[PDB]
């Protein structure tokens, strides 16, 4: 049982978008995957309801949930949690509770200093360091910031995973319909997605 959790307070770094996709590829990968929606607007939990996710949700409604997810989903290979978008009890609650800690974040030209905000708590954990990495989401090919956020991740000490997630309109259009990429036919989303997925897999050996 592993406990992974998509962290970020500042909304629009695409967590959700990243979670719906990346449990949907673990589930094509025989993991059975359970998805803890920890965001008051329960945006991954409405989508749910549209369609047949590939994996199983679960709201916490609040901290409560969280810190018993070593216990509630124990049966489960993977517990992917959906960060919310604020620094509540809950953020660091995340962190607790989890082997890995994903950040999405996406280049944009003033909004990476709502991102380190995580990286602190992770120094919280004194024996007790669990894993992080640094997804790069919403990419586009504006050279210029791509490199402004790649050197800026550094100045943390957290490597970010070598794919990045592009800025696709699959990714927009999946929600849209009730599922994920995996379920239309933009090669080049499930293509990013999966080799993305692999890296996460071989952060537990
Ligand atoms: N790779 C991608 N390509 C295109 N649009 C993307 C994208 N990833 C995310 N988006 C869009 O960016 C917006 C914010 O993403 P998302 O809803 O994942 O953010 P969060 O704000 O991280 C979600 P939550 O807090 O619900 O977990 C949404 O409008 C979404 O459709």
Redesign the pocket.
Known sequence: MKVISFL?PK?????????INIATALSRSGYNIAVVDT?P?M??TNWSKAGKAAFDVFTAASEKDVYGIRKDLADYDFAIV????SLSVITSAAVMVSDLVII?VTPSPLDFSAAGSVVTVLEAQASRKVEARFLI??KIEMATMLNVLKESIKDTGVKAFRTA????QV??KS?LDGDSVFESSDGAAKGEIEILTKEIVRIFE
Request: no cysteine; charged share 20%; hydrophobic share 25%.
């Open positions: 970020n909304g629009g770094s695409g967590k959700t978008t990243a979670v965001d607007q945006s991954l959906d960060g919310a978008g999405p989401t919403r997630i592009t800025q696709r990714y927009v929600i």
